[PDB]
């Protein structure tokens, strides 16, 4: 459990001099919070006689098969996990403010596109009083930026 | 893992659209309100707090409905003309947003809420309940 | 000195005796029901539990009313048909006596309660509310 | 210059360079004087693609 200062109020409002009084502004909030932790479990079986007289070790393989499946599933859940018995991810809960890029024309049609304007506008539009901020994108998406061409043909 | 949060903090209905209800705060030692709407509002909407006494016929049955004098804190600028407590749901409260409030000095054995006169049309759209905090027995 | 307990475990109406009400439980991580009868009952009354899903059109309005899957624990020895969360208010439950319970495994976005077929007439004399608990929102 | 067949007067950077280098260097070194808006006018010119 943890606290989250929601907002400050406002108290010091300008007033005229010749009066011996003041004005009670409004106070803020504290908004105590909480949160849980979820579990990850499962089982499998072998066969005494099969595993014993087998070509090679099958057990240790399943061990590594669990640690990685746990590893990849956690990160995958941490991003897009639906609240129920899974950590609510930052993709799907739609709490982050999300932009969208308006389409372009082609031969009279109108197709959705992702120009070089967007990525330069998107990254440079982030409140400068929150500090620096890294970005994330899939390798192919960056491979889309690299191979961009202007009207003549130059990169 | 959710705890059985009904074996403490047990709530009861206080205003289900068109019917008030006495809710005993005798044993418990702390209690508030949770105002939640079901539709849009039209104008402002007030509510009148009350309290009751154990009737002489049976010490476990509601008596009459007496109001609650609003005790002021520090830094109060206005007091209702009669000095009786009153809570108002401000205009423009969307029906997916709960409001919270409580009277700062308990008196009696149980509480009651009712729409202030002339403001009983919107009153239907409101739903009020009361939670608790202690046991004492 | 009674703390405002509206915030920090508010409550909402789940079954007002006439119609059910879905109560959002997404922003909170714990919840429970506080039953309360208004009059003398006739026969054992049971209630069916339902959980909902965010509608594909609007992500914070009710969808359909899916049925919560009942889950046993260590010493559960009388699971009903196929498993469905269904609590039963026993008889010999006079008024001014609240009973409370909850469902162990949460699922969906919010819960709704409705009288089981065969107990709707008795259920017109009962009230059910929920008091969530704490969580981040 | 013929803006869509209208022939408005104009003054473009090609004029300035051709005007200042034409000074016969046998007279000496010469300084040019002008109003600061004109220099602002030169500094804001654009070629058809849009660059400065």
């Amino acid at each position: 459990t943890y606290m989250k200062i929601a907002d400050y109020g406002q108290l010091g409002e300008y007033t005229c001099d010749a009066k011996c009084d003041a004005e009670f502004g409004e106070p803020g909030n504290i908004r105590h919070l909480e949160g849980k932790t979820y579990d990850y479990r499962g089982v499998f079986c072998f066969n005494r006689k099969n595993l014993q007289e087998a070509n090679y070790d099958f057990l240790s393989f399943m061990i590594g098969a669990a640690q990685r499946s746990h590893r990849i599933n956690r990160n995958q859940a941490l991003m897009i996990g639906k609240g129920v018995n899974e950590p609510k991810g930052w993709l799907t809960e739609n709490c982050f403010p999300v932009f969208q890029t308006l389409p372009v024309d082609v031969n009279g049609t109108s197709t959705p596109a992702f120009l070089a304007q967007d990525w330069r506008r998107f990254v440079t539009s982030f409140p400068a009083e929150y500090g620096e901020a890294r970005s994330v994108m899939h390798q192919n998406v960056f491979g889309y930026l690299a191979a961009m061409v202007d009207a003549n043909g130059r990169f | 893992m959710n705890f059985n949060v009904g074996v403490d903090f047990p709530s009861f209905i206080a205003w289900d659209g068109e019917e008030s209800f006495p809710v005993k705060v005798d044993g418990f030692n702390q209690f508030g309100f949770t105002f939640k709407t079901i539709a849009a509002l039209t104008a402002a909407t007030t509510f009148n707090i009350f309290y009751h006494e154990p009737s002489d016929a049976d010490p476990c049955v509601p008596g009459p409905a007496i109001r609650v004098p609003e005790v002021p804190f520090c830094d109060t600028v206005l007091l209702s003309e009669d000095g009786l407590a009153a809570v108002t749901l401000p205009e423009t409260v969307t029906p997916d947003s709960f409001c919270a409030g409580t009277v700062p000095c308990m008196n009696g054995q149980w509480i009651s809420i009712a729409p202030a006169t002339g403001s009983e049309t919107n009153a239907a759209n409101v739903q009020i309940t009361v939670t608790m905090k202690g046991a004492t027995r | 000195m009674n703390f405002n307990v509206g915030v920090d475990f508010p409550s909402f109406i789940a079954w007002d005796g006439e119609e059910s009400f879905p109560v959002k439980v997404d922003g909170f991580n714990q919840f429970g029901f506080t039953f309360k009868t208004i009059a003398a009952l006739t026969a054992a009354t049971t209630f069916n539990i339902f959980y909902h899903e965010p509608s594909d059109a609007d992500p914070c309005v009710p969808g359909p009313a899916i049925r919560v899957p009942e889950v046993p624990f260590c010493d559960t020895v009388l699971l009903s048909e196929d498993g469905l969360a269904a609590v039963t208010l026993p008889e010999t439950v006079t008024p001014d006596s609240f009973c409370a319970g909850t469902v162990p495994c949460m699922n969906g976005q919010w819960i709704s309660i409705a009288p089981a077929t065969g107990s709707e007439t008795n259920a017109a004399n009962v009230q059910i509310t929920v008091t969530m608990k704490g969580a981040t929102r | 210059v013929d803006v869509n067949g209208t022939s408005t007067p104009a003054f473009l950077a090609q004029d300035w360079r051709r005007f200042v280098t034409s000074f016969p260097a046998e007279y000496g070194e010469a300084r040019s004087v002008m109003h600061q808006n004109v220099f602002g006018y030169l500094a804001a010119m654009v070629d058809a693609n849009g660059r400065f």
């Binding site: 932009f99 | 997916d96 409030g101 | - | -």
Partner: peptide, 28 residues
């Protein structure tokens, strides 16, 4: 004196059009 304290339950999804400068067109 009741101190009403109110929060919203569901946050409505947002979507902002990330408009950008149109292509350069001469004035004339």
């Amino acid at each position: 004196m009741v101190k009403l304290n109110c929060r919203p339950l569901c946050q409505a999804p947002t979507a902002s059009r990330l408009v950008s400068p149109p292509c350069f067109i001469c004035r004339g």
